[PDB]
């Protein structure tokens, strides 16, 4: 029992948050003082194992872990899921500068993962958590080492997960951001996407999305994993976007 392990008695589970399909997600308090977010249910726990080796400000942080009834105490993200955020009420008001900045922060969390020689493998809006001040953090490392509409073709087909398949997924994440959370490849079933993506099909520029940002998406979707940008490049590109790339940006109806 390593030094991440706590007494369950130190926890006060409080509010179901909290969907809810692989076990549960609760709000809580830890050691009476700390506002945390628990996570109920054996190796599951794989997520906790990897979040022991990772620590970055744009990755939701492991606090503590348990046995069942196995809990994973973690940083509390007050705004929940990004997917919900984007399609909920606080979604119609988000424009390009907010959304690009959200992109920037996810790229920063993913740039760290990249430095650390990890692969996330399940990178998408559902797996980004939002807090106050529009802070976005990469969550749900359950599948991380050392769904196909977000999965690079080579990884979906031959199980070839690399940082570069995360990049692909990032490109699809960018479309979720730019469309307020719409499912990628509108009106396409899983099999039609695989076959079409194999044939060279890529999603078009979202309405109101500048061509410079869709090009970035297309870079992330290059057939050739190794020809896709790094996260360090995407972080920097997104951070500087409004000066270096679209300094003539004017708001529109939706972006």
Swiss-Prot record:
Question: Where, per UniProt, does this protein localize?
Answer: Cell membrane; Mitochondrion inner membrane; Endosome membrane; Nucleus
Residues with PTM Phosphotyrosine: 158, 249
S-nitrosocysteine modified-residue sites: 220
Q: What is the effect of changing residue 220 to A?
A: Significant reduction in S-nitrosylation
Domain Protein kinase stretches: 11-242
Q: Which amino acid positions bind ATP, per UniProt?
A: 17-25, 39
Q: Where is the active site?
A: 122
Tissue expression summary: Expressed to high levels, and with a high degree of kinase activity, in certain fully differentiated cells such as neurons, platelets and macrophages. Isoform 1 is widely expressed. Isoform 2 is expressed only in the muscle.
Recorded superkingdom: Eukaryota
**What modifications does the entry list under PTM / processing?**
Dephosphorylated at Tyr-249 by PTPRJ. Phosphorylated on Tyr-249 by c-Src kinase (CSK). The phosphorylated form is termed pp60c-src. S-nitrosylation is important for activation of its kinase activity.
Q: Which residues form a coiled coil?
A: none
Functional description taken from the UniProt entry: Non-receptor protein tyrosine kinase which is activated following engagement of many different classes of cellular receptors including immune response receptors, integrins and other adhesion receptors, receptor protein tyrosine kinases, G protein-coupled receptors as well as cytokine receptors. Participates in signaling pathways that control a diverse spectrum of biological activities including gene transcription, immune response, cell adhesion, cell cycle progression, apoptosis, migration, and transformation.
Q: How does it assemble?
A: Forms a complex with polyoma virus middle T antigen. Interacts with AFAP-110. Interacts with GJA1 and PXN.
The protein here is known as Proto-oncogene tyrosine-protein kinase Src
Tell me which species this is from.
Answer: Gallus gallus (Chicken)
Q: Covered range within the whole protein? A: 257 to 533 of 533
